[PDB]
Structure 1
Amino acid sequence: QDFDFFYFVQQWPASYCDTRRSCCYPTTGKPDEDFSIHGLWPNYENGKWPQNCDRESSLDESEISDLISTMEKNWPSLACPSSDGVRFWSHEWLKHGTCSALGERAYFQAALDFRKKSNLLENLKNAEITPRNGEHYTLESIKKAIEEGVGHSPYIECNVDTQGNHQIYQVYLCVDKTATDFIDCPIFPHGRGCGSKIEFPPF
């Protein structure tokens, strides 16, 4: 009951699909070449977080019916076998959404709204940071470009492609507990930060 803030986590689809993991496009076809939503996670300032707050509250698709087509494109599941994303959304809703104090519809609308508000791809483009092979960009340039359009610093999570290149994988931004506005992150994710120069791979 109650938490401190939300980590709003977006992902670069291309970086989930160029590793040794299996990646399958959603039953709706190849996803947009844009940052997608991974999740909206309630969190505590002490680094821990609540999860699975209502193991009885299953995902009611009727509450987000008119949002399904948008989510298939902005919150796709890239896991295999190819799915419609419902399993992925049900998982995020049960594990994290039930702990957000938000109704199911508000929770998913919130995620969609912040993905749009943060407008990562465009902000990067405005700084001449566009997808291409190889570790062509400085982490600093990427962080500031995002800071410019959001007004808050993001945390960048990097992984590695089959080539061994370090690439931008996920972008963390913090949202206030009422899911109204972006805020400065009280704390940043555990895992190791990125290298000084990283790859922003295309599909």
Structure 2
Amino acid sequence: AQDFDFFYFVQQWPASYCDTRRSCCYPTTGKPDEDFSIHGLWPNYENGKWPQNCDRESSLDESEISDLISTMEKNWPSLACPSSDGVRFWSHEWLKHGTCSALGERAYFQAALDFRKKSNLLENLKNAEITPRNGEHYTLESIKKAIEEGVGHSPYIECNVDTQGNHQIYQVYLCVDKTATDFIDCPIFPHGRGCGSKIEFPPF
């Protein structure tokens, strides 16, 4: 029956996408909030492979999520250049991953928004006294533990490197069950050997 096993729910730390050697452009709506934003909700298999581009005939219909656009501009902004309203980013995510989710367009985007709010990363880190600042000031362990206490499941953290060589928290992966109802323990995690023991949680 069900075409896949679980979802990776991926969030990015905007400031870490914008302090690297690559180009970053603020959205048509201006500088994003200093908070974790959605990268994607990705159907996946327990074997590490995943389905993608399941219905190449299905394009993103904005009327279906009209009332959600202003919220998505702030919670799912595109930071790529050139600057955009996010729609291209959302259309691409819908076509590549959403069409493989078994969810209708609105349910897919509502699920991503709902899980970003539920995971409440910035606040869970704040409770643990982990707040944005420059330099590799935080242990990776404290970051994972803070998120885990708040979500009830352990995240996978992907790090990248800023312009000054600092290793920084870049993306956070959590797993959601195939019916997109709750967070679950991840059956598998990516293997992108990354994140030293001390990392940066950069401000904008």
Stretches of 4+ moved more than 3 A in 1?
none
Q: Which deviations, in whole Å up to 9, do the C-alpha atoms of 1:129-181 show, x marking residues without a partner?
A: 00000000000000000001000000000000000000000000000000000
Q: Which deviations, in whole Å up to 9, do the C-alpha atoms of 1:12-50 show, x marking residues without a partner?
A: 000000001100000001100000000000000000000
Q: Which deviations, in whole Å up to 9, do the C-alpha atoms of 1:54-85 show, x marking residues without a partner?
A: 00000000000000000000000000010000
Paired with 2:3 and 2:179, the residues of 1 have a C-alpha distance of 10
What SS is found at the alignment partner of 1:6? strand
What SS is found at the alignment partner of 1:130? coil
What SS is found at the alignment partner of 2:47? coil
> C-alpha root-mean-square deviation of aligned residues, in Å?
0.6
Structure 1: which 5+ runs fail to align?
A: none
Paired with 1:40 and 1:189, the residues of 2 have a C-alpha distance of 15
Q: Which deviations, in whole Å up to 9, do the C-alpha atoms of 1:58-114 show, x marking residues without a partner?
A: 000000000000000000000001000000000000000000000000000000000
State TM-score, norm by structure 1: 0.99
- Residue 192 of structure 1 and its aligned partner are, at CA, apart by 1.1
In structure 2, the partner of 1:39 is 40
- Residue 193 of structure 1 and its aligned partner are, at CA, apart by 2.6
- Residue 190 of structure 1 and its aligned partner are, at CA, apart by 2.4
Paired with 2:53 and 2:30, the residues of 1 have a C-alpha distance of 31
Matched pairs, number = 203
Paired with 1:62 and 1:189, the residues of 2 have a C-alpha distance of 35
State TM-score, norm by structure 2: 0.99
Paired with 2:11 and 2:135, the residues of 1 have a C-alpha distance of 21
In structure 1, the partner of 2:30 is 29
Paired with 1:194 and 1:44, the residues of 2 have a C-alpha distance of 24
In structure 2, the partner of 1:182 is 183
Structure 2: which 5+ runs fail to align?
A: none
Paired with 2:38 and 2:122, the residues of 1 have a C-alpha distance of 13
What SS is found at the alignment partner of 1:142? helix
Paired with 2:43 and 2:193, the residues of 1 have a C-alpha distance of 21
Paired with 2:195 and 2:26, the residues of 1 have a C-alpha distance of 27
- Residue 195 of structure 1 and its aligned partner are, at CA, apart by 0.4
